[PDB]
Short mmCIF file of C-alpha atoms in Angstrom, two decimals:
data_model
loop_
_atom_site.label_atom_id
_atom_site.label_comp_id
_atom_site.label_asym_id
_atom_site.label_seq_id
_atom_site.Cartn_x
_atom_site.Cartn_y
_atom_site.Cartn_z
CA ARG E 228 -1.41 -25.26 18.56
CA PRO E 229 2.00 -24.21 20.05
CA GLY E 230 1.01 -20.49 20.50
CA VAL E 231 0.17 -17.06 18.94
CA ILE E 232 1.25 -15.57 15.63
CA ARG E 233 1.36 -11.82 15.09
CA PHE E 234 0.64 -10.71 11.47
CA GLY E 235 0.84 -7.04 10.57
CA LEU E 236 -1.49 -4.98 8.38
CA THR E 237 -1.24 -1.58 6.73
CA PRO E 238 -3.93 0.26 4.71
CA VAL E 239 -2.38 -0.85 1.33
CA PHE E 240 -5.81 -2.42 0.82
CA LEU E 241 -9.18 -1.71 2.43
CA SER E 242 -8.27 -2.79 6.01
CA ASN E 243 -11.42 -1.05 7.25
CA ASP E 244 -13.52 -3.93 5.88
CA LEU E 245 -13.97 -5.80 9.09
CA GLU E 246 -15.51 -8.66 7.21
CA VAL E 247 -12.27 -9.37 5.36
CA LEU E 248 -10.26 -8.95 8.48
CA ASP E 249 -12.32 -11.83 9.77
CA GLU E 250 -12.11 -14.23 6.86
CA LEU E 251 -8.43 -13.46 6.68
CA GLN E 252 -7.76 -14.41 10.25
CA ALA E 253 -9.77 -17.54 9.63
CA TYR E 254 -7.80 -18.68 6.61
CA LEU E 255 -4.51 -17.98 8.25
CA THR E 256 -5.00 -19.85 11.47
CA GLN E 257 -6.28 -22.90 9.62
CA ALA E 258 -3.41 -22.86 7.21
CA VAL E 259 -0.84 -22.19 9.92
CA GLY E 260 -2.48 -24.37 12.54
CA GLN E 261 -1.84 -21.90 15.40
CA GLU E 262 -3.93 -18.86 16.27
CA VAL E 263 -3.01 -15.82 14.17
CA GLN E 264 -3.69 -12.30 15.28
CA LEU E 265 -3.92 -9.41 12.85
CA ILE E 266 -2.14 -6.26 13.99
CA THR E 267 -2.68 -2.66 12.95
CA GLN E 268 -1.15 0.68 13.81
CA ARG E 269 -1.88 4.33 13.16
CA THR E 270 1.08 4.80 10.83
CA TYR E 271 3.30 2.77 8.52
CA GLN E 272 6.43 3.64 10.38
CA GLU E 273 4.90 2.05 13.57
CA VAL E 274 4.26 -1.27 11.77
CA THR E 275 7.68 -1.20 10.12
CA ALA E 276 9.31 -0.88 13.62
CA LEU E 277 7.42 -3.86 14.99
CA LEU E 278 8.39 -5.86 11.90
CA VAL E 279 12.10 -5.02 11.86
CA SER E 280 12.31 -5.86 15.58
CA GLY E 281 10.69 -9.30 14.98
CA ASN E 282 7.72 -8.42 17.25
CA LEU E 283 5.65 -9.43 14.19
CA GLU E 284 6.37 -12.68 12.35
CA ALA E 285 5.32 -11.07 9.04
CA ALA E 286 3.28 -8.10 7.78
CA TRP E 287 1.65 -6.75 4.63
CA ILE E 288 3.55 -3.49 3.92
CA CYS E 289 4.28 -0.96 1.24
CA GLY E 290 7.18 -1.31 -1.20
CA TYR E 291 8.82 1.87 0.12
CA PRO E 292 9.27 0.69 3.74
CA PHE E 293 10.56 -2.59 2.41
CA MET E 294 13.33 -0.96 0.33
CA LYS E 295 14.22 1.55 3.02
CA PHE E 296 14.92 -1.42 5.31
CA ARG E 297 15.91 -3.77 2.51
CA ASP E 298 18.72 -5.23 4.54
CA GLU E 299 16.68 -6.08 7.59
CA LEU E 300 13.75 -7.71 5.84
CA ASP E 301 12.95 -10.39 3.27
CA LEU E 302 10.05 -10.89 0.92
CA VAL E 303 7.56 -13.63 1.72
CA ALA E 304 5.05 -13.14 -1.12
CA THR E 305 3.53 -10.40 -3.28
CA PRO E 306 -0.13 -10.02 -4.34
CA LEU E 307 -1.20 -10.55 -7.93
CA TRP E 308 -3.54 -7.90 -9.22
CA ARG E 309 -5.12 -8.26 -12.60
CA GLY E 310 -2.44 -10.61 -13.92
CA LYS E 311 0.76 -9.01 -12.60
CA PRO E 312 2.25 -8.22 -9.16
CA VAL E 313 2.33 -4.46 -9.92
CA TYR E 314 0.37 -1.22 -9.29
CA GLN E 315 0.39 2.51 -10.01
CA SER E 316 0.19 5.73 -7.94
CA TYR E 317 -2.78 7.92 -8.88
CA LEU E 318 -2.70 11.63 -8.49
CA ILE E 319 -6.38 12.51 -8.00
CA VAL E 320 -8.48 15.63 -8.17
CA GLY E 321 -12.14 16.58 -8.06
CA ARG E 322 -14.39 15.05 -10.73
CA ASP E 323 -15.40 18.43 -12.08
CA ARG E 324 -12.10 20.19 -11.68
CA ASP E 325 -10.99 21.66 -14.96
CA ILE E 326 -7.18 21.19 -15.16
CA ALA E 327 -4.58 19.81 -17.56
CA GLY E 328 -1.66 18.30 -15.61
CA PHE E 329 0.37 18.16 -12.41
CA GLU E 330 1.67 21.72 -12.73
CA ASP E 331 -1.85 23.04 -12.29
CA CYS E 332 -2.09 21.67 -8.74
CA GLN E 333 0.29 24.39 -7.60
CA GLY E 334 -1.33 26.01 -4.62
CA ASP E 335 -3.65 23.14 -3.75
CA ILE E 336 -4.40 21.79 -0.34
CA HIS E 337 -3.01 18.27 -0.92
CA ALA E 338 -3.67 14.96 0.83
CA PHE E 339 -0.82 12.44 1.10
CA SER E 340 -1.34 9.01 2.71
CA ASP E 341 1.71 8.53 4.82
CA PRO E 342 5.25 9.90 4.71
CA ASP E 343 6.41 6.30 4.29
CA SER E 344 4.04 5.44 1.39
CA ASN E 345 5.31 4.92 -2.14
CA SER E 346 2.00 5.60 -3.91
CA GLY E 347 0.80 8.04 -1.25
CA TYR E 348 3.89 10.23 -0.97
CA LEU E 349 7.12 9.15 -2.69
CA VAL E 350 5.89 9.17 -6.26
CA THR E 351 4.47 12.65 -5.92
CA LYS E 352 7.56 13.81 -4.01
CA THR E 353 9.51 12.77 -7.09
CA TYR E 354 7.30 14.97 -9.32
CA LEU E 355 8.04 17.86 -6.97
CA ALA E 356 11.78 17.16 -6.65
CA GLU E 357 12.20 17.07 -10.45
CA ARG E 358 10.82 20.59 -10.44
CA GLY E 359 13.11 21.81 -7.65
CA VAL E 360 10.24 22.39 -5.15
CA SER E 361 9.07 20.81 -2.02
CA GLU E 362 5.53 20.32 -0.84
CA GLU E 363 5.74 23.40 1.40
CA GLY E 364 6.79 25.47 -1.67
CA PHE E 365 4.39 24.00 -4.20
CA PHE E 366 1.19 23.50 -2.14
CA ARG E 367 -0.52 26.02 0.16
CA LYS E 368 -1.19 23.13 2.55
CA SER E 369 -0.42 19.41 2.64
CA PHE E 370 -1.27 16.73 5.21
CA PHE E 371 -1.17 12.99 5.81
CA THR E 372 -4.44 11.00 6.04
CA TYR E 373 -2.76 7.79 7.28
CA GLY E 374 -4.46 5.62 4.70
CA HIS E 375 -5.33 5.44 1.04
CA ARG E 376 -9.05 5.13 1.47
CA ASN E 377 -8.75 8.26 3.51
CA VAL E 378 -6.95 10.15 0.76
CA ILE E 379 -9.89 9.48 -1.58
CA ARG E 380 -12.33 10.64 1.06
CA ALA E 381 -10.39 13.80 1.63
CA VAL E 382 -10.48 14.64 -2.07
CA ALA E 383 -14.13 13.58 -2.52
CA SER E 384 -15.35 15.57 0.45
CA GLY E 385 -13.54 18.76 -0.67
CA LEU E 386 -11.16 18.71 2.35
CA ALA E 387 -8.26 18.39 -0.12
CA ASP E 388 -8.06 19.80 -3.69
CA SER E 389 -5.88 16.92 -4.87
CA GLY E 390 -4.37 13.75 -3.42
CA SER E 391 -1.78 11.00 -3.91
CA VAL E 392 -3.19 7.48 -3.64
CA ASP E 393 -2.56 3.74 -4.21
CA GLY E 394 -4.24 3.09 -7.56
CA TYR E 395 -5.29 -0.46 -6.60
CA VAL E 396 -7.21 0.98 -3.63
CA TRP E 397 -8.84 3.53 -5.94
CA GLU E 398 -9.88 0.92 -8.53
CA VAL E 399 -11.31 -1.36 -5.82
CA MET E 400 -13.24 1.48 -4.20
CA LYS E 401 -14.55 2.50 -7.61
CA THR E 402 -16.72 -0.61 -7.29
CA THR E 403 -17.24 -1.04 -3.49
CA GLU E 404 -18.00 2.69 -2.87
CA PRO E 405 -18.80 4.00 -6.32
CA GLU E 406 -20.58 7.24 -5.38
CA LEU E 407 -17.66 8.44 -3.32
CA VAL E 408 -15.00 7.54 -5.79
CA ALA E 409 -17.11 9.24 -8.44
CA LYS E 410 -16.48 12.58 -6.87
CA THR E 411 -12.83 12.15 -7.86
CA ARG E 412 -10.91 11.57 -11.06
CA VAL E 413 -7.36 10.48 -11.92
CA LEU E 414 -5.16 13.41 -13.14
CA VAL E 415 -1.83 11.55 -13.39
CA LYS E 416 -0.91 7.89 -13.36
CA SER E 417 2.60 6.86 -12.52
CA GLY E 418 4.70 4.10 -14.07
CA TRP E 419 4.24 0.63 -12.62
CA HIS E 420 5.87 -0.34 -9.33
CA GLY E 421 6.08 -3.48 -7.28
CA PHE E 422 2.82 -4.24 -5.48
CA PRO E 423 2.93 -3.89 -1.69
CA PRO E 424 4.38 -7.21 -0.43
CA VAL E 425 4.20 -9.33 2.70
CA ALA E 426 7.59 -9.48 4.42
CA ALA E 427 9.43 -10.54 7.53
CA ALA E 428 12.60 -9.89 9.47
CA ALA E 429 15.84 -11.23 7.83
CA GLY E 430 17.55 -12.46 11.05
CA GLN E 431 14.52 -14.80 11.45
CA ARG E 432 14.24 -15.89 7.73
CA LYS E 433 15.06 -19.57 8.58
CA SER E 434 11.82 -19.77 10.66
CA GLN E 435 9.05 -22.27 10.91
CA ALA E 436 6.42 -19.62 10.98
CA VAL E 437 7.46 -17.74 7.90
CA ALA E 438 7.50 -20.91 5.94
CA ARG E 439 4.15 -21.81 7.39
CA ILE E 440 3.07 -18.35 6.47
CA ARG E 441 4.70 -18.17 3.07
CA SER E 442 2.81 -21.30 2.28
CA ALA E 443 -0.54 -20.00 3.43
CA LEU E 444 -0.26 -17.09 1.07
CA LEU E 445 0.61 -19.01 -2.05
CA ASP E 446 -2.04 -21.65 -1.48
CA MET E 447 -4.73 -19.18 -0.65
CA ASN E 448 -6.42 -19.59 -4.01
CA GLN E 449 -6.63 -23.30 -3.21
CA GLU E 450 -9.03 -23.21 -0.26
CA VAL E 451 -12.63 -22.30 -0.02
CA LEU E 452 -12.11 -19.48 2.40
CA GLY E 453 -8.90 -18.23 0.90
CA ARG E 454 -10.75 -17.93 -2.37
CA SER E 455 -13.43 -15.84 -0.74
CA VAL E 456 -10.79 -13.52 0.84
CA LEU E 457 -9.14 -13.03 -2.59
CA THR E 458 -12.46 -12.20 -4.18
CA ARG E 459 -12.94 -9.55 -1.55
CA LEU E 460 -9.59 -7.97 -2.16
CA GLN E 461 -10.06 -8.34 -5.91
CA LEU E 462 -6.70 -10.15 -6.06
CA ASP E 463 -5.74 -13.25 -8.18
CA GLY E 464 -3.60 -14.49 -5.21
CA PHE E 465 0.04 -14.33 -3.97
CA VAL E 466 3.27 -15.24 -5.79
CA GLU E 467 7.00 -15.28 -4.94
CA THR E 468 9.08 -12.35 -6.17
CA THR E 469 12.59 -11.02 -5.51
CA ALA E 470 13.88 -7.54 -4.52
CA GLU E 471 14.29 -6.69 -8.27
CA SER E 472 10.53 -6.08 -8.48
CA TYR E 473 11.04 -3.09 -6.21
CA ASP E 474 13.86 -1.37 -8.22
CA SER E 475 11.48 1.27 -9.75
CA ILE E 476 10.83 2.38 -6.13
CA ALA E 477 14.42 2.36 -4.89
CA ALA E 478 15.40 4.42 -7.97
CA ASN E 479 12.76 6.98 -6.95
CA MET E 480 14.16 7.05 -3.44
CA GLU E 481 17.52 7.76 -5.07
CA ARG E 482 16.10 10.46 -7.40
CA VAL E 483 14.53 12.24 -4.38
CA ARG E 484 17.77 12.16 -2.37
CA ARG E 485 19.96 13.20 -5.34
CA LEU E 486 17.61 16.03 -6.30
CA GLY E 487 17.13 17.57 -2.74
#
């Protein structure tokens, strides 16, 4: 009862599903006792600012923002998806597009998710950097959709010739929106990276709320609601991890910088 908790969301899952946004708020307030409010922004960077500055108690964010601000944030918990707390980046093209590999997308109009996304930018940036080109040199046009669901839409609709997307989001939409997703196919799958975690500011790690929150996430599979929420997100639940999960990502950040 003491007040109001601010919990941040990013489109690292289907945050358009208002139904889930509801159940989720429900499970959290019960588990935490106080009223929890879910926050969203237009971009990742915006959420990341609010989180670093402690304006949000915690937030569900991509692995890339977490490592970029590694020092100013700590892990709370990481989703489990199909057994393991990991995911891939999918480079997607049109279903009927006849092409072999990445190199054939030269000259595409390309949809990225967010300049701060691992699966929606960084991974593909790496593929470019290893070939000594940038997006402006390799693609005839590129743009940010500010969300993974949106990348898939862009490709499916024909607005983009190819796209870079969170593979979890793609595999979930393959079942919740199968006709859309069926207008795309996966051209390249990355290696496995740490699943987008929940996290909080480091100079407020020793906090009641985080602990209250860290708890809510691990025990989610133990409530009736929390089990409904998980079913919706197609996740097994949340586990504790350390920064070492996210090394694959930091090493890509390093490859991009060193290759530039």
